[PDB]
Amino acid sequence: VMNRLILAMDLMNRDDALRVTGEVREYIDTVKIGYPLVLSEGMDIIAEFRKRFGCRIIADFKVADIPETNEKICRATFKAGADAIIVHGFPGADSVRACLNVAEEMGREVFLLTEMSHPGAEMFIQGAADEIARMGVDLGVKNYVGPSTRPERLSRLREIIGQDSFLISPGVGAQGGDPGETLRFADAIIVGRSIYLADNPAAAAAGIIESIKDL
Amino acid sequence: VMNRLILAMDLMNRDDALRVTGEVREYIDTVKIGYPLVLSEGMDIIAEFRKRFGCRIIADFKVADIPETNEKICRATFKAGADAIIVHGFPGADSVRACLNVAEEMGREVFLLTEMSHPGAEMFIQGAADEIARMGVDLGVKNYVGPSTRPERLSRLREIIGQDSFLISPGVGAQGGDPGETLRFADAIIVGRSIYLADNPAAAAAGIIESIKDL
Numbered sequence A, B: 001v002m003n004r005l006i007l008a009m010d011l012m013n014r015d016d017a018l019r020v021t022g023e024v025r026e027y028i029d030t031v032k033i034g035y036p037l038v039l040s041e042g043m044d045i046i047a048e049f050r051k052r053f054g055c056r057i058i059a060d061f062k063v064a065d066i067p068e069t070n071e072k073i074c075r076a077t078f079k080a081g082a083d084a085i086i087v088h089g090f091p092g093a094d095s096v097r098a099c100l101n102v103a104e105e106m107g108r109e110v111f112l113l114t115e116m117s118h119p120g121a122e123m124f125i126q127g128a129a130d131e132i133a134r135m136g137v138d139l140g141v142k143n144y145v146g147p148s149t150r151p152e153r154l155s156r157l158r159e160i161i162g163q164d165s166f167l168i169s170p171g172v173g174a175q176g177g178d179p180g181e182t183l184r185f186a187d188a189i190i191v192g193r194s195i196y197l198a199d200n201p202a203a204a205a206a207g208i209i210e211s212i213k214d215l
């Protein structure tokens, strides 16, 4: 991804989301669109973004249902033009496999979310995360998400998935993660509020890239 | 809920979803709408159903993000007219509390999904599920979801949440669960495909209710 930086576009207004995305487009090559924007403006926003910005779109839908429902969610999401979808690993291998089957059918990608970045992830997810990552490897998952807020965990996740797998990492900025340290282990960082709530989102993005280029 | 039966409306077409829901409306009082329908037809389908059918709507969005994103998802969902939202407990107490805070602000309800009904739930969720339920009790959650496919687990979950808590249960019919056995422990059952894929959905719903009445 361009400059190893993915914008988490979680504004909930089409005009504000378009404005900020257009302002930082020279500094990114992929935008993560989640439910805050989609549930407020509709699934058509994915193809609008893909067209107007020529960016790749990751649908951060944290898919976490039974296999039959996961298949439907993935089909709707790729039909809407998303390049990839983020899927939770904790519902188990059959739920992940359902998403992989639809991605194979539609020529798209699945990212497996292993450990999450927020404090509550320590309660249940962290204890299962190594095993979720190993499950991913066994299923042939090549794209993973793990937490900027815990670089020791990001290191362990990288160890499990190997160097060939692609690893992206949220929790940079607002949640306390650091771009440089996270990029020791992740291929790309995801950044939302530090950019989209900034007085000058382009200046915020540029500042991040300057720190990245230095690594 | 009327007749202790909630329709899981996971058809992806507005016309088919409206047809089936209309045909079975005399036998239910609540419709569970999830991402298959919403991502295909838009969030406005929630208010359409509420208006047309005068039914309560549970948004089955399996909310499973960090606290800040959860609050955004819950706000959009209640703005759209949902009566309640289903939230995963696996991501931890702060993520659940974020949803409870928005439900409190907006005068709506949260259902906490503890153990899931599909085979993959055995890998990670089942081992955490008693603790997820206890966490719900500690947070003051009053509405829970647990699996028709494992009535011994449903019994244990009922034990933890007490008799005053409201418990709904999917996995009836297509996934193998039984209405009568599940209603030993749950207050209401959720049924999707056994009704919506039936040649005569009204006849399928009526058959289920006849079996419920006998208990």
Ligand SMILES: N#Cc1cc(=O)[nH]c(=O)n1[C@@H]1O[C@H](COP(=O)(O)O)[C@@H](O)[C@H]1O
Pocket: A008, A010, A034, A060, A086, A113, A115, A116, A117, A118, A145, A146, A147, A170, A171, A172, A173, A174, A175, A190, A191, A192, A193, A194, B065, B066, B069
């Ligand atoms: N993908 C993802 C995901 C997994 C995770 O463990 N932690 C996150 O913050 N996220 C998402 O990344 C973004 C982080 O944004 P921010 O930079 O904290 O504002 C949000 O969209 C959040 O929902």
Ligand SMILES: N#Cc1cc(=O)[nH]c(=O)n1[C@@H]1O[C@H](COP(=O)(O)O)[C@@H](O)[C@H]1O
Pocket: A065, A066, A069, B008, B010, B034, B060, B086, B113, B115, B116, B117, B118, B145, B146, B147, B170, B171, B172, B173, B174, B175, B190, B191, B192, B193, B194
């Ligand atoms: N709520 C919920 C949920 C939790 C769970 O553990 N198992 C489920 O099947 N569900 C949902 O209930 C419905 C079950 O539908 P069906 O009766 O198997 O066709 C689907 O919407 C599924 O996504």
